[PDB]
Amino acid sequence: STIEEQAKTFLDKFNHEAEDLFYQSSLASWNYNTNITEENVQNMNNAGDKWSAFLKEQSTLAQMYPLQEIQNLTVKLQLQALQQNGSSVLSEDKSKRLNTILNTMSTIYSTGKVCNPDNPQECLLLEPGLNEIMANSLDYNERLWAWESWRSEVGKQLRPLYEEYVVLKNEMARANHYEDYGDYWRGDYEVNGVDGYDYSRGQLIEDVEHTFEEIKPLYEHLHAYVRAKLMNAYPSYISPIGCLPAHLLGDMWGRFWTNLYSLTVPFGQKPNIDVTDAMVDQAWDAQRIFKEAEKFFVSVGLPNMTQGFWENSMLTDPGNVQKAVCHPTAWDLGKGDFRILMCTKVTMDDFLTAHHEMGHIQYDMAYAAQPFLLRNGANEGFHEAVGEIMSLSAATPKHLKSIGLLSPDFQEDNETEINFLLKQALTIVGTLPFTYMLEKWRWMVFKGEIPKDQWMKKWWEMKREIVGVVEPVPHDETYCDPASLFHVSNDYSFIRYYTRTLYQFQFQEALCQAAKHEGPLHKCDISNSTEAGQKLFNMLRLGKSEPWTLALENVVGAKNMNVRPLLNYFEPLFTWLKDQNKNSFVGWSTDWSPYAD
């Protein structure tokens, strides 16, 4: 007759009722995303509304169990997830208005087109047109047009929608007993109940800032190096002491500097490692590629892929007759149904991302015996971090050689190694100031510290200081450049990417230490290491049952995120950059601008 036994039976009923409902919703949404029809979208929305209604009923029910009287930490967590009022604490009409503007912002972002003024017949949307320009164009004026057209068109529409989005979301979280929407988001990292492993919500700011401080010097030297190399590419447009123009960074916003490798290559004489030519030439079976990833995962002590996966997954582009969503996704439908949706081409980038998504699936396969509400990553960063350690191991030249796409030349100069590390930094450290600043700006906006009349003023002030990037043309408060990113205009938190980048190198160092690796960390391939496999599976199996801090300690020995894995991974490139910038300016000028008056 105890409350705990009553709560246990309630949780049993919820798990068994929700497993089947979630499976029906997942099947319907899969049939939509793999087969875009009106029947499929209506079936998906029907199943999703059924699932949400069941969840809200169970929420109002679970709110009837006084959490404070629960002595079982595992059950208290499941009950807490259910007792979350979420959007329901909003009035009905106000919630409808919030959902309406959310869908409107998502639509205009994914549908916005900009047309060339010289030839109003050429019009491009963000993908693939505008992205093709921002990735491959070397013309300053064309890139500036692309940058300014995307922002001044879609972001201006997004501005008022985004103001209403901010105000309603801050109120809801407050009604849900938080300070702002960022605090709600920061609640994902909150731990409350485990003695010795708890971790507060301001410690995240403390930890993120303390760690970004240590990242600061490495980023400064890479910034100086890239700045000089870009001066050779855009003469008379870049000051040797100023911030980088925002439209020359390799994509529409600067989230990744990937396409600057051609302009920043240290030693272009060495053949830059591209296995795409080897893949097309080697007998190729898209099936075999995904099978090779499967062979990789079994070699470290993990199970095969399920027969359901190989039969229900979509491993090729279905063609012109069948239109599908091609964003690579790893689907955990429930009831042991695991699939991968990918319009795979025979490419090197897709090889690593296939490893990444199948890493997700291995995570998803793991902790399957856990209760429903515990089928999730330790925090929001664990799944992507896992996928990325997979992709690094697959990207090492030793693994590439052992699989047979590289002849056993085994060429590895001290220049071939620095080339690879430089390309990694363009991606890995180029995204850290972007991620930290976006979430810092968003957090402050949610807190109400940035007046409405200085959104863009403070946005670009913060832009300059942290990332070292300056806008090519001035923007008043009519413009709205923060909403020009997908994650911001689609209500996705962004700090997961900062946290996942640090987690992945902690994991990589730990698993390579487990594999007794000796050379530089970036040359480590954890293949054929059942010990590393077990240590990762030992963490994968927890799901959300244990705090992420306890789960992280179980594998790496530390209760918190650490920067030494990343710095040790990049140490050789760091010294090479320090040498290369001796006669170069290090640091940024908070005052130089391209435009004047």
Add this chain to the structure above:
Amino acid sequence: NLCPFGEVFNATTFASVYAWNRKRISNCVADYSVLYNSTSFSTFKCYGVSPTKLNDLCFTNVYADSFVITGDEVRQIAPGQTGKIADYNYKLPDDFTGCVIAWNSKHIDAKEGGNFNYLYRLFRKANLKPFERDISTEIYQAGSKPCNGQTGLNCYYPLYRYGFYPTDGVGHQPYRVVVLSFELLNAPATVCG
């Protein structure tokens, strides 16, 4: 010579786990070498006698228990290892003299629309003593307050229904189970191989 005795083993449909079925077998020629080359049995292990001596033995009384359960729960059909099936649905005596049989039906019991014809008990007052059934639809009420009327806040309907789709994982695909038990008596009936 009158009983294939498998009208049980292969047929159209079986019964639920909470309402498992019993059948008497008599006057039979039990040949189980062809069933060794039958659809592979997920599991076939004997406890009281030898699978290499089965037909030689001439036992008196034989009974057959047939029912359907999930894939992960199948390994609970054994003495000990008490669990959901092993308590609330179908327990075996600790001293057991017989054999247990199970096989997998890929799409026989599973349809594209889904199969919701098999039930199972989740809430019961006490663990079932060996070879017991309780088919009563008594609204379980562990909290003191006995609603007793209908569905309640702390009350629950004790019977749940399997969902079996043709895209499920192996852990919960329809497993079909048959249990053979030879009661120990000093009285003869007609069975031998």
